[PDB]
């Protein structure tokens, strides 16, 4: 809508770059936390127009950060990633604020993607005409 941004949570610092550059490539803006509790300054701070949380990052989650995010905005627009098929904290961090869950596993265009379908800003789809 209005800076429309997207916050990634990784420690290994590549992953951020992924879809930093990835979101970014499409057109978005993005920006990136080792921990959770850094895009979670940045959600009060910045306030985001999506956030990511790889509860796979390397130590630790941002689940009670999505937590406090949405404690600060109820739903911003969150993703947490997990191990694809391990989820194990990702009931609590769906219902905060989480608008849904990906994988660390992801697909990059996957990624771009999913977002754009959720939040929207450039890139489209198409889901109005039914047709592609």
Same mark, same amino acid.
């Given at each position: ?22 979101f970014?490539?499409?057109?978005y803006? +993005?920006?990136?936390? #080792? @921990? %959770? !509790? ?9 306030? =985001?127009?999506?956030? !990511?949380?790889?509860? $796979?990052? =390397? %130590? ?14 109820? @739903? ?5 990633? +997990? ?14 604020? #989480?608008? +849904?869950?990906?994988?660390? =596993? ?9 977002? $754009?379908?959720? !939040?929207?800003? $450039?890139? @489209? ?8």
């Amino acid at each position: 809508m209005m800076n429309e941004k997207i916050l990634i949570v990784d420690d290994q610092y590549g992953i951020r770059i992924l879809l930093n550059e990835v979101f970014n490539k499409e057109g978005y803006q +993005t920006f990136q936390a #080792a @921990n %959770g !509790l850094q895009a979670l300054d940045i959600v009060t701070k910045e306030r =985001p127009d999506l956030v !990511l949380l790889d509860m $796979k990052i =390397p %130590g630790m989650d941002g689940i009670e950060i999505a937590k406090r995010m949405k404690v600060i905005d109820e @739903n911003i627009r969150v993703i947490i990633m +997990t191990a694809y098929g391990e989820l194990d904290m990702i009931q609590e961090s769906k219902e905060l604020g #989480a608008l +849904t869950h990906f994988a660390k =596993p992801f697909d990059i265009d996957e990624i771009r993607d999913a977002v $754009k379908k959720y !939040l929207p800003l $450039k890139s @489209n789809l198409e889901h109005h005409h039914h047709h592609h």
